[PDB]
Amino acid sequence: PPKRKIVLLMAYSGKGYHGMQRNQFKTIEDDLVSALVRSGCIPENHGEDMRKMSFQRCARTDKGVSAAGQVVSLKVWLIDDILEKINSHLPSHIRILGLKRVTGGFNRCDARTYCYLLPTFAFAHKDRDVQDETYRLSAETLQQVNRLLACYKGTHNFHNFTSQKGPQDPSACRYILEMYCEEPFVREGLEFAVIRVKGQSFMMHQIRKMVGLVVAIVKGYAPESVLERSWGTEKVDVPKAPGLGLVLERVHFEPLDWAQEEGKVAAFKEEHIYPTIIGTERDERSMAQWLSTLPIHNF
Ligand SMILES: [Cl-]
Taking the centre of ligand 1 as the mean of its atom positions, its distance from the CA of residue 59, in whole angstroms, is 7
Whether the CA torsion 274, 276, 281, 282 is positive or negative: it is positive
- CATH code 3.30.70.660 for 110-299: yes
CATH for 1-109 is 3.30.70.580
Taking the centre of ligand 1 as the mean of its atom positions, its distance from the CA of residue 18, in whole angstroms, is 11
Taking the centre of ligand 1 as the mean of its atom positions, its distance from the CA of residue 207, in whole angstroms, is 8
Cβ neighbours of residue 206 closer than 8 Å, sequence gap 6 or more: 158, 161, 162, 174
Where does CATH 3.30.70.580 sit in the chain?
Answer: 1-109
Distance CA 204, CA 154 (A): 19
Distance CA 4, CA 20 (A): 23
Distance CA 231, CA 210 (A): 12
Where does CATH 3.30.70.660 sit in the chain?
Answer: 110-299
Cβ neighbours of residue 239 closer than 8 Å, sequence gap 6 or more: 209, 212, 213, 215, 216, 293, 294, 297
Q: Quick check: helix, strand or coil at residue 290?
A: helix
Distance CA 61, CA 66 (A): 8
Given the DSSP bridges, would you call strands 190-200 and 246-252 parallel, antiparallel or unpaired? Answer: unpaired
Taking the centre of ligand 1 as the mean of its atom positions, its distance from the CA of residue 119, in whole angstroms, is 19
Q: How far is CA 150 from CA 23, 145, 147, 177, 196, in A?
A: 34, 8, 5, 10, 11
Closest CA to 116 of 298, 283, 29, 241: 241
Could you confirm whether 81 is annotated as catalytic? no
Q: Quick one: 132 exposed, middle or buried, by C-beta within 10 A (0-12, 13-18, 19+)?
A: exposed
CA dihedral 166, 168, 171, 177 (to 10 degrees): 100
Nearby residues for ligand 1 (ion, Cβ within 5 Å): 61-62, 65
Taking the centre of ligand 1 as the mean of its atom positions, its distance from the CA of residue 173, in whole angstroms, is 19
Question: Beta-carbon neighbour count of residue 256 at 10 Å?
Answer: 16
Catalytic residue, candidates 62, 129, 132, 169: 62
121 φ/ψ angles, rounded to the nearest 5 degrees: -70, -5
Q: How was this structure determined?
A: X-ray
Taking the centre of ligand 1 as the mean of its atom positions, its distance from the CA of residue 189, in whole angstroms, is 29
Resolution (A): 1.8
